[PDB]
Amino acid sequence: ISASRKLQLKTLLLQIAKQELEREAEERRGEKGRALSTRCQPLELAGLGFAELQDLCRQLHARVDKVDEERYDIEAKVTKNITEIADLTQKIFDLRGKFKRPTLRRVRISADAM
Amino acid sequence: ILAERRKVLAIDHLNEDQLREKAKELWQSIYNLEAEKFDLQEKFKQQKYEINVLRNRINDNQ
Amino acid sequence: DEDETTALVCDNGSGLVKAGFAGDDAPRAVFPSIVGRPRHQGVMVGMGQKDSYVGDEAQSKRGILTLKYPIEHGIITNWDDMEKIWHHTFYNELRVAPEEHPTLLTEAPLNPKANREKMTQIMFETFNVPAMYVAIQAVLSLYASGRTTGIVLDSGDGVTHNVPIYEGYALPHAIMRLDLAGRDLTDYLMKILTERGYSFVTTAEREIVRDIKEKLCYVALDFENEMATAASSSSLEKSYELPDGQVITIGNERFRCPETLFQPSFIGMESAGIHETTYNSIMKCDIDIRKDLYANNVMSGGTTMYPGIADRMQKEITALAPSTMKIKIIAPPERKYSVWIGGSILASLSTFQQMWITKQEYDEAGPSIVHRKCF
Amino acid sequence: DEDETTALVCDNGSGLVKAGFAGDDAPRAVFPSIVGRPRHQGVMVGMGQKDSYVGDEAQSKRGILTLKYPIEHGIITNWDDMEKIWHHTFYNELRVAPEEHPTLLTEAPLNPKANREKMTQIMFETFNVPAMYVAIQAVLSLYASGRTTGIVLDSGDGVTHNVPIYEGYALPHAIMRLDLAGRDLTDYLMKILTERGYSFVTTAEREIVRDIKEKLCYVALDFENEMATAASSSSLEKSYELPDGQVITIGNERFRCPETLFQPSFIGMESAGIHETTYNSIMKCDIDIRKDLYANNVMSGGTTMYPGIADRMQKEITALAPSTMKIKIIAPPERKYSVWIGGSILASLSTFQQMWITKQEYDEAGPSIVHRKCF
Amino acid sequence: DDIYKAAVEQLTEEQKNEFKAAFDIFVLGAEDGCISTKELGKVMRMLGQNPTPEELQEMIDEVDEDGSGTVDFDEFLVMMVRCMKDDSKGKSEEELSDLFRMFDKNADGYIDLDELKIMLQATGETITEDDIEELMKDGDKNNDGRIDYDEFLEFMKGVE
Numbered sequence A: 001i002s003a004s005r006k007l008q009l010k011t012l013l014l015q016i017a018k019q020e021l022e023r024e025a026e027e028r029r030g031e032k033g034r035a036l037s038t039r040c041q042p043l044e045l046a047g048l049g050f051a052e053l054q055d056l057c058r059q060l061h062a063r064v065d066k067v068d069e070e071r072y073d074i075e076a077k078v079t080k081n082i083t084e085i086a087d088l089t090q091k092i093f094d095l096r097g098k099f100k101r102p103t104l105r106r107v108r109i110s111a112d113a114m
Numbered sequence B: 001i002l003a004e005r006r007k008v009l010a011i012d013h014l015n016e017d018q019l020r021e022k023a024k025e026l027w028q029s030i031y032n033l034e035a036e037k038f039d040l041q042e043k044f045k046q047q048k049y050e051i052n053v054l055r056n057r058i059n060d061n062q
Numbered sequence C, D: 001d002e003d004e005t006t007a008l009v010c011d012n013g014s015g016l017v018k019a020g021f022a023g024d025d026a027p028r029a030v031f032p033s034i035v036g037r038p039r040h041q042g043v044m045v046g047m048g049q050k051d052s053y054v055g056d057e058a059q060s061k062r063g064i065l066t067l068k069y070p071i072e073h074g075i076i077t078n079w080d081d082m083e084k085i086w087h088h089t090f091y092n093e094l095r096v097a098p099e100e101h102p103t104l105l106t107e108a109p110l111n112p113k114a115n116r117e118k119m120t121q122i123m124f125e126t127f128n129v130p131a132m133y134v135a136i137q138a139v140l141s142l143y144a145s146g147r148t149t150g151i152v153l154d155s156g157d158g159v160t161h162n163v164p165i166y167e168g169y170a171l172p173h174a175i176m177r178l179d180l181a182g183r184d185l186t187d188y189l190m191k192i193l194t195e196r197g198y199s200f201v202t203t204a205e206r207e208i209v210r211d212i213k214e215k216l217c218y219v220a221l222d223f224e225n226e227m228a229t230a231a232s233s234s235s236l237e238k239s240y241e242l243p244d245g246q247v248i249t250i251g252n253e254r255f256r257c258p259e260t261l262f263q264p265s266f267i268g269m270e271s272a273g274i275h276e277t278t279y280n281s282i283m284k285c286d287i288d289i290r291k292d293l294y295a296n297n298v299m300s301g302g303t304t305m306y307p308g309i310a311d312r313m314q315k316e317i318t319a320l321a322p323s324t325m326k327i328k329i330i331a332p333p334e335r336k337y338s339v340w341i342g343g344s345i346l347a348s349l350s351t352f353q354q355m356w357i358t359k360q361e362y363d364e365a366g367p368s369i370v371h372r373k374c375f
Numbered sequence E: 001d002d003i004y005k006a007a008v009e010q011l012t013e014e015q016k017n018e019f020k021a022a023f024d025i026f027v028l029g030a031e032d033g034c035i036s037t038k039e040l041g042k043v044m045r046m047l048g049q050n051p052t053p054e055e056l057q058e059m060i061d062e063v064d065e066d067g068s069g070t071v072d073f074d075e076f077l078v079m080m081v082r083c084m085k086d087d088s089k090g091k092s093e094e095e096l097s098d099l100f101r102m103f104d105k106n107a108d109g110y111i112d113l114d115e116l117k118i119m120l121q122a123t124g125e126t127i128t129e130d131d132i133e134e135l136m137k138d139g140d141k142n143n144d145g146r147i148d149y150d151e152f153l154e155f156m157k158g159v160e
């Protein structure tokens, strides 16, 4: 098989993944917007007096504390996977290094020149 | 850490105009923090994908 | 010649020293472990001449020189001669020297420890090397060969080490060291060629018979059948050209020399041969090791260039080995050079950069440091 | 990662560890309860190599490792080793982090406190499991076996439990902790195979004998006539292939090993054996209980997979038992895996959702809580 | 055809300018603009490759499909990327990891033949019975029947 068929299909294959990845990002933006509407609903502050506005303020204090408690735990979970990835990646590098490390190089040229 | 990170509003001694503005300040903070949670959750899932791929790569080269 | 402080690598035996720089997959040049001296009285003047000759100089002017080898069975007995050989190796021909480069040496696991102590002292005090490491020849053969496991028969010039390695670890209880090597095979050959009417006694003659062995000899997969024909027919004979235009015609001696590897009794040694020796290095290891060592018989060093050695060894081990089990042999073109090559690989590995003795640790501890820092 | 926050279940014996998630019908993976460590000095560099290997890694790399068992006849004495086995189990084979799931572990109640206390502590403090539950092996075996009443014979690697249960209740005065197990059967076989000319004294050798036992041995309902012939004829010997290709044949020794369970004097133990111990557990229960236990002897754990064992046990008990009555053995295919299967069943029962220790109650009380919340 | 177009697309401006300037050494001047094949060894070295005489001859042996005795400029770029892999950037592991995940619809850690076919047919390019398998066997260096994450990264290095 000609190089041009093989290269164009792996090229087209990567290009479709790029379109799908751009969609993943748009889908995440769409879902984040909807998640925000329901997770952090708007304040009905207009038309309220002192006691009513204080209740909104107290509710927000509880809500900001809760959003950081959950954010912190999620942040820790993201961090845990990053640490495991760095460790798994190094194990892979050493297993693979054993296959090519000791034998691959650009050598024995001066051997003929001399 | 959370006590240091959470924002706190003045409440009991504020009048209506002050309370509307203070309620607004945490609302936007919460909104932005919920946005971070969403993105962190998506990052977590993408990183979990990489984790299982890597666990298999170790066994595949061993 | 070089634009980086790469480690230098030297494989110093009783035959030749292979040398070059780390990162290459071959030595840059070969330096015979020879110091030559005139055995005649000079008559003419204005003739140049040396007090002593080394390496290739020693061989090129050998017609009137006696040629001596400073190394015996892997041990330097004359290190003043090795310093002259090394000075030439480094400063005249390879154009690199320990003075501006770290240096790796290759050695057997049971090489007398005092020998490493002296080589360590020389490279640090005579050649001013900034750092050193002395590596196991079997390790170097396994890196060059693409393996972490196997029995390495390092076939030196004066001794064969025979050490099993598994998963990168030594299995020292199963080392079967044998006092049989390429230089002893030469002795057998010259004695049998003497029987045919071609004695080899003096230096020029000693060098010729070594050269005959390297170019004409082989082991073959079956000695007795090879002899049934070689001892019966001239069709198995080969005429070798001697320096003066005369020739020597050699018959079954062509294989009887190499055969000493399988029959050490030929030179008076109390041994069953290299295949039995390899077998015991495998067989004395635990049974969950044995399968990996049977699958990895690694030939290295010299004499492995003899035709039929891969087949002779695999078949003899298979015969000694349990049935069902698969016996495999590694005998790459990186033969005779694989110890040097492994030295290049090891010296340059990133995993080895902290394994070097620096010329700080050396002076604080002295030469005996090699016994604690290398192996 | 799962479709429910299902408990994870891990059955950690002195032999092997079976693990998977609650609600399945099998463990996802089985590991030896082994942590292996190299007993050799490394020679090559950049070889990777762990300080310790666990489970199947420990067995696959065993050629140069000493293999230790963290569990001693049902008791974890080395909890650092069990934490590593568990991390491997949970993250590499089950692929589920315990932080999001309750975990159920098992032990005999006869176990002298430390096992349930440390099992609870490891999962709460090193894995941050949200909840814990240490289960009874007899309970788990009866659920897996389809019984509420009967005697659980779990004759596995560590200790034989032999605990009777009636209408879901323990009858603890009748439970006889018995120091006769699969691990002792292996040691006996290593010694009698030594007499035959095949010595087994090292770790690799111990693992081989265990493999021989598991594949070649049987108990026989009639060992006396079986040995009269097996000890007289090669026609009853079975060949086993050793890792290095050598072959061992085993004759009356094949059953002689399992026979120890009925003849404990073979290993120096002062015991009546498992059939009489089971009988005595039945006898020690009230007279209106005895009949239900005689009719419901239930096999679990290991060694219960030997040919002739269900018949050997039923006949020995029948011989000790009174007339008129029918003595019966239940021997489900969920043998050896029955404690794990029971864990899956128990963890998932609605009537067992209040039995879990939460990771709140644990910290307020500490690990001694296991004595108030589990049993 | 498309291999020749792709080699042009993959070489950057600071590189293609050197390739044509050095490659023009193939014509002596006041001739016919032939651009001969015997000059390939010289240009490999002029552009920074460091081949042995055997390698210089191999570059020559791999050109001249029509027996014309010449090398065109786009043909040269194709022959150079097969000798000296001067692609454009060539991306990264992070970029291909995120893209890998898109083909791995079932999150199995590899791309099997069905995913490979769906992703390609989805581009509008017609996929025939022997296609897809031809790529799988290219990426699948270990002959395991699929292209895994590691194999994917090797397979698509230099792909846009």
Ligand SMILES: Nc1ncnc2c1ncn2[C@@H]1O[C@H](COP(=O)(O)OP(=O)(O)O)[C@@H](O)[C@H]1O
Pocket: C011, C012, C013, C014, C015, C016, C017, C018, C155, C156, C157, C158, C182, C183, C213, C214, C215, C217, C300, C301, C302, C303, C304, C305, C306, C336, C337, C339
């Ligand atoms: N065709 C051959 N026949 C016999 N011996 C050989 C042949 N080729 C190489 N050798 C031997 O190789 C030896 C030199 O290389 P080597 O022993 O590997 O270095 P070192 O002795 O330092 O380990 C010499 O003894 C030489 O005779």
Ligand SMILES: Nc1ncnc2c1ncn2[C@@H]1O[C@H](COP(=O)(O)OP(=O)(O)O)[C@@H](O)[C@H]1O
Pocket: D011, D012, D013, D014, D015, D016, D017, D018, D154, D156, D157, D158, D182, D183, D210, D213, D214, D215, D217, D300, D301, D302, D303, D304, D305, D306, D336, D337, D339, D340
């Ligand atoms: N075919 C067999 N022959 C002899 N013994 C067996 C066989 N199958 C299982 N056993 C024994 O089972 C023991 C494992 O005990 P096990 O019941 O699985 O502990 P746990 O209940 O905690 O999982 C091992 O010693 C093994 O030899």
